[PDB]
Amino acid sequence: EQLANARRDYEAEIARARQEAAKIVAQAQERAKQQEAEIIAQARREAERLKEEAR
Amino acid sequence: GINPTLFIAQLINFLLLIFILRALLYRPVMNLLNERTRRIEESVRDAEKVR
Numbered sequence: 001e002q003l004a005n006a007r008r009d010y011e012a013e014i015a016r017a018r019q020e021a022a023k024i025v026a027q028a029q030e031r032a033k034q035q036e037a038e039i040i041a042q043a044r045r046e047a048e049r050l051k052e053e054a055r
Numbered sequence: 056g057i058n059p060t061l062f063i064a065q066l067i068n069f070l071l072l073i074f075i076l077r078a079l080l081y082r083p084v085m086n087l088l089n090e091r092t093r094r095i096e097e098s099v100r101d102a103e104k105v106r
Contacts, residue, residue, distance in 0.1 A: 002101075002105050003101050003104065003105045006105045
């Protein structure tokens with residue numbers, strides 16, 4: 001029974017690790033989408049400020 | 056008086072003895088000693104394998 005639970009825990013831990021890695025990549029993709037979205041938005045705001053100070 | 060024919064007859068008696076006892080017990084009992092040794096060996100290998 002020790003060997004049985006060890007094997008089942010090995011594959012189950014791999015499975016839960018893949019679930020948590022799916023969560024990790026989802027979080028990383030969310031962070032990337034965010035970061036790029038407001039980086040472009042902040043570029044837009046800085047361009048608007050440049051136009052305003054030019055005026 | 057020792058008779059060579061009776062001596063050979065003792066040899067046949069012990070041949071019957073050794074062969075029938077061996078076939079009916081010792082190979083089953085060699086399977087038994089191999090069972091205990093081989094099973095302890097299985098336990099050992101499975102021990103380092105599980106850790």
